Amino acid sequence: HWGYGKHNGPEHWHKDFPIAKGERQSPVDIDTHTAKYDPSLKPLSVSYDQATSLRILNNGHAFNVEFDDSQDKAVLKGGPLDGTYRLIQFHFHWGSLDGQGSEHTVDKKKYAAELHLVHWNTKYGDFGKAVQQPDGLAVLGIFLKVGSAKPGLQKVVDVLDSIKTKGKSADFTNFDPRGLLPESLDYWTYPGSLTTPPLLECVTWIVLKEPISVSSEQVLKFRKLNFNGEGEPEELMVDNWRPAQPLKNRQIKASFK
Numbered sequence: 001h002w003g004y005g006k007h008n009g010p011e012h013w014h015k016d017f018p019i020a021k022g023e024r025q026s027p028v029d030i031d032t033h034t035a036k037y038d039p040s041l042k043p044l045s046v047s048y049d050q051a052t053s054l055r056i057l058n059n060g061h062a063f064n065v066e067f068d069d070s071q072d073k074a075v076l077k078g079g080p081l082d083g084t085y086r087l088i089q090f091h092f093h094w095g096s097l098d099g100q101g102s103e104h105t106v107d108k109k110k111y112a113a114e115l116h117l118v119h120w121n122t123k124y125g126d127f128g129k130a131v132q133q134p135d136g137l138a139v140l141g142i143f144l145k146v147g148s149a150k151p152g153l154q155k156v157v158d159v160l161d162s163i164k165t166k167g168k169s170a171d172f173t174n175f176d177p178r179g180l181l182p183e184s185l186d187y188w189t190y191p192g193s194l195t196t197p198p199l200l201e202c203v204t205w206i207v208l209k210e211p212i213s214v215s216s217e218q219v220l221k222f223r224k225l226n227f228n229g230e231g232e233p234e235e236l237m238v239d240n241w242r243p244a245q246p247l248k249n250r251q252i253k254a255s256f257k
């Protein structure tokens, strides 16, 4: 199956997922000079006060922190969005070294990692129906650079030893995702896709301009995870990012003048 290596990575995905060559694929390079301020964007509302985290899982590609999405606890509204989008999970993409790891790029700059907070449009009732709609999902993307430690990330870092291999999970209750945000909510937005198979073109992307800073020690612990399962040859979980894809007939809009 699909992955990130030479023999199953992004250059091979199109053979089983032909939408990989589609008209609204993600990620993209964000040309900051071309992006245009959009006065029609409404204020963005990140409402995570009542979030209920449940579990953290190594799925063989990344790790996901999963949330209770049975009711409108943690939601994203406003900005480019029509209606309410419910948080279901977050995960990261990262590199083998600090000079790469992000999926989106900014004037071709690659960051050390990228956080994706994944939300589904409640008008469609469940995540599975939402991924059959052009406006089914909203992903909030946040860049990570290496500098000072991020206190709100440390609980994640310290549980990774217990989910080293594919298929392992651990309880992860009472985690507050607000500790992963930067100060500013200035953002760029465009219509795109999932960045992993099945590559479905259902996503409104909201990419924050301000990175968060994490320490070298924090990202080094991400790089100790394994793509493989227990009892199998060790393959370090690094470079789990898709490169930028063609922009085609799209425009990136900015929330800020």
Ligand SMILES: NS(=O)(=O)c1ccc(CCCCO)cc1
Pocket (backbone or CB within 6 Å): 116, 118, 131, 139, 193, 194, 195, 196, 197, 198
């Ligand atoms: N890297 S991403 O934020 O675009 C992302 C989010 C969510 C999925 C899961 C799709 C499951 C389809 O049934 C896959 C990728």
Ligand SMILES: OC[C@H]1O[C@@H](O)[C@H](O)[C@@H](O)[C@@H]1O
Pocket (backbone or CB within 6 Å): 049, 050, 051, 052, 173, 174, 175, 176
């Ligand atoms: O425990 C993590 C978070 O859980 C949420 O349900 C609470 O409302 C927050 O105050 C708390 O920080």
Ligand SMILES: OC[C@H]1O[C@@H](O)[C@H](O)[C@@H](O)[C@@H]1O
Pocket (backbone or CB within 6 Å): 036, 251
């Ligand atoms: O026709 C003019 C319009 O062109 C579009 O491509 C831009 O998104 C708008 O901001 C502009 O007003």
Ligand SMILES: OC[C@H]1O[C@H](O)[C@H](O)[C@@H](O)[C@@H]1O
Pocket (backbone or CB within 6 Å): 155, 159, 171, 172, 173, 174, 175, 176
């Ligand atoms: O909040 C996420 C997790 O952080 C720490 O690991 C706590 O020890 C644990 O109880 C909690 O579930």
Ligand SMILES: [Zn+2]
Pocket (backbone or CB within 6 Å): 091, 092, 093, 116, 195
């Ligand atoms: Zn992602």
